[PDB]
């Protein structure tokens, strides 16, 4: 039941999503090993993901969390990069999309830095890079990231390297 609706580049919504993508690029400690060497992106398309059943699943849970946290969902907009992007937009997030070996345990991981999510587009550590050229720093091939609505509720703070 998912449909994808293209946003026009003249649309305010396109422009505010592009600005969050571009302005949250940083340098990474691996020198570009996982995600490539870059300071900015060429945005090719932005699409709104529309699925009534998946939206109602999200809002049902948001309301449960809010009622457990003094009517505060603590909702954020965060990036997610994954080899499973195509399954996620059709079926929603579930246990199959978790980073089993993540340093905060098996869960679904999201980033404020779009460039952090870019490291996972082709798999953990960048995998073997793009399928066509086997290049983690490929400048030709088209990549996809998700910009997601995320309910944090009461969040456990881990101070970490």
């Amino acid at each position: 039941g998912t449909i994808l609706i293209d946003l026009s580049p003249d649309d305010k919504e396109f422009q505010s999503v592009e600005e969050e993508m571009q302005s949250t690029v940083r340098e990474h400690r691996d020198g570009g090993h996982a995600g490539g060497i870059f300071n900015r992106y060429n945005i090719l398309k932005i699409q709104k993901v529309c699925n009534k059943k998946l939206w109602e699943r999200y809002t049902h849970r948001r309301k449960e969390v809010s009622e457990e946290n003094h009517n505060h969902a603590n909702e954020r907009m965060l990036f997610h990069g994954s080899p499973f992007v195509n399954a996620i937009i059709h079926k929603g997030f579930d246990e199959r999309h978790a980073y089993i070996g993540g340093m905060f345990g098996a869960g679904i991981y999201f980033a404020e830095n779009s460039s952090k999510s870019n490291q996972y587009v082709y798999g953990i550590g960048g995998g073997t890079g793009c399928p066509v050229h086997k290049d983690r720093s490929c400048y030709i091939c088209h990549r996809q990231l998700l910009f997601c609505r995320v309910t944090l509720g009461k969040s456990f703070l881990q101070f970490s390297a």
Partner: protein, 47 residues
């Protein structure tokens, strides 16, 4: 998947060495995220 720590709905990973890094977050229930935008892009070679 693992469970959230007792009494919590998520984990926040605060950067503690690299002063430029932003936070990372983990949820343990797929129902706590909705994939609202799909962004297609290329990384650009610095000049």
């Amino acid at each position: 998947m693992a469970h959230s720590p007792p009494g919590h709905h998520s984990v926040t990973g605060r950067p503690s060495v690299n002063g430029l890094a932003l936070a990372e977050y983990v949820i343990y229930r797929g129902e706590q995220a909705y994939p609202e935008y799909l962004i297609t892009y290329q990384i650009m070679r610095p000049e």
